[PDB]
Amino acid sequence: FIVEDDESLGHKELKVRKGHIAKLMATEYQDIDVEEYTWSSLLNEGLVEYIDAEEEESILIAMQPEDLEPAEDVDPAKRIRVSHHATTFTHCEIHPSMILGVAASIIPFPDHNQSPRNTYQSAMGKQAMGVFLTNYNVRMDTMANILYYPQKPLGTTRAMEYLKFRELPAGQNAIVAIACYSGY
Amino acid sequence: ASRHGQKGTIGITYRREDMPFTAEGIVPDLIINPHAIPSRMTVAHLIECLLSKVAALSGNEGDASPFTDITVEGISKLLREHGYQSRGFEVMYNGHTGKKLMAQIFFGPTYYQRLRHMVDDKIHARARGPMQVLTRQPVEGRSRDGG
Amino acid sequence: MIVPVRCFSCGKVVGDKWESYLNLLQEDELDEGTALSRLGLKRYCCRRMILTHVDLIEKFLRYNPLEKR
């Protein structure tokens, strides 16, 4: 995202407003007759900008627009999220959860795990068994495994909405009991 | 496998009348060892199970995005409001004798993935078989009945 | 791919309860939880049966059949 000087509010503020969000939702709902408003509109009107690893050296980015942007009681269970005590941001993250990979976005709460376990899943979710394509009946793949009843996960991630994981699942919601029942 | 690297083979299969059960009659699909959780420090399996239980009760799929403001206390309050214990434990009963289990069992739905390493594609036996053309020694591979 | 006939845990028949659930969501503007509760699925083991099922045959049946009479 782009942070402007924004002299109206007297502090740094993102260029995107609720109007652009409403227009994006309107286009997203018309696709599923209004004026088309897609990612090219955000890219061409200065609302978002492409930053590579070169420009990340000489910029300053914020986690959330709702916390690190405005000038500053706390929940006893919420994590300590620092606001960096400085409001001079020139860019803002669209969402931090988009630092993950594809099969590492399958993990429910990857920040609540030890990182080797996230690596083991992200190299193990490829090894899962489930429906891969919807035309598996007409494909002569050398090996193919299809679950009978693939169920979309109960605890899901927003990121797998765009990965079509709820449309093509790779597992089942098993009733897990964490117990030492018989020693097997 | 879980969605947290908690892979493992099937130890044994019990029928329903042997395998333990809660007071609501819900016999679990799958019993996992407690000792696998804290050595690996896998907490997201527990929170995923709690959120999935709340999602199954309320009928709305649970958000498990990494960096949201969703804590264990809120999910615990929702599970308490749905009529179960706040931390997900249920008082279950032994299947063999019907006596209550002295310790309460963490319980609930959790997304598991079946992995391709079936036992049928890995079992191997050979008493005698085809030898190699070069060294007169048993051949490579389980498809060719090798050593 | 289509709805299982029975809950794997408890065994209550839910294969006849899928089109009713889709009917309740489609035209009555209901939440999923209340519609699931009205079908008599009070245990969450049966609730993850209908809530979490994806209807894959709606994507399967769009292909033409291999043999047509």
């Binding site: 939702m25 309107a26 709902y29 929940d75 899901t156 927003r158 909405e161 | 959120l51 709340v54 999602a55 309320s58 709305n60 799929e61 649970g62 958000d63 498990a64 949201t68 403001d69 969703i70 804590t71 206390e73 809120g74 999910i75 309050k77 929702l78 | 503007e29 939440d31």
Partner: peptide
């Protein structure tokens, strides 16, 4: 605490009501 659910169907109904 915030609601830990993905309920976009009610968001769909609310946005179609807004339009």
């Amino acid at each position: 605490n915030a609601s830990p659910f993905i309920k976009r169907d009610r968001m769909r109904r609310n946005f179609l009501r807004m339009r």
